[PDB]
Write an enzyme that holds these catalytic residues in place. Structure first.
Site: not given
Ligand SMILES: [Ca+2]
Length: 220
Positions: A40, A84, A174, A176-177
């Site tokens: 995402h 994801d 923020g 995320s990932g």
């Protein structure tokens, strides 16, 4: 990261910042050429910033490398944030040193109760915690039932919850990932959740241990 603490500088050498004008997601270096992140967080091209601690101040430990390829998992489903996970190929190899190092992929799936570490430059939701300085937080993997109880019918095989049902400690936008490291292995990727550190709404993470074949074959 909400409820965490400032990581010791460079203690998470695999942590990277995705930047296209500003920091918008995290990522994890898995070798000199690849970074694992969240699907995402996809963008056709992005500058990967490695060796960072304070993303607003130049420290002399950074390496800024533009991506050459950004590959989302073929089964990524955006409406439910399923599968994801994503791979980012660096246009040039990163120099592995004291500030930049890869994190190993999982050799198996970590059981519920395993204590891990999640980090990132996402919101801290605190007036004293500086999100510009890499934040660290220890979070335990939660059982599937606690996960599904929190998000009824929304938890897939490619997901796992981690954190505290009581709230107060969690990852946030923020982050995320970013990485979820357990016993020296990348078990998760910051993926989603409702709100941040809210009671009854733990963080949800992409379960890396079920994508080993896709990851290794893609990087091969
Ligand atoms: Ca910096």
């Amino acid at each position: 990261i909400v409820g965490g603490y400032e990581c010791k500088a460079y203690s998470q050498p695999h942590q990277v910042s995705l930047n296209s004008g500003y920091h918008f997601c995290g990522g994890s270096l898995v070798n000199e050429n690849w970074v694992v992140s969240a699907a995402h967080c996809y963008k056709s091209r992005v500058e990967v910033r490695l060796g960072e601690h304070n993303i607003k101040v130049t420290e002399g430990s950074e390496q800024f490398i533009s991506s050459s390829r950004v590959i989302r998992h073929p089964n990524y489903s955006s409406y439910n944030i399923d599968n994801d996970i994503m791979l980012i190929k660096l246009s040039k190899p990163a120099t592995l040193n004291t500030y930049v190092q890869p994190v190993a992929l999982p050799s198996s799936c970590a059981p519920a109760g395993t204590m891990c570490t999640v980090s990132g430059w996402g919101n801290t939701m605190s007036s004293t915690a500086d999100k510009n300085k890499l934040q660290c937080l220890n979070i335990p993997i939660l059982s599937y039932s606690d996960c599904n109880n929190s998000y009824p019918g929304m938890i897939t095989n490619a997901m796992f919850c981690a954190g505290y049902l009581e709230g107060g400690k969690d990852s946030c936008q923020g982050d995320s990932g970013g990485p979820v490291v357990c016993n020296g292995e990348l078990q998760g990727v910051v993926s989603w959740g409702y709100g941040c550190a809210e009671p009854g709404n733990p963080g949800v993470y992409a379960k890396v241990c079920i994508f080993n074949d896709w990851l290794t074959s893609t990087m091969a």
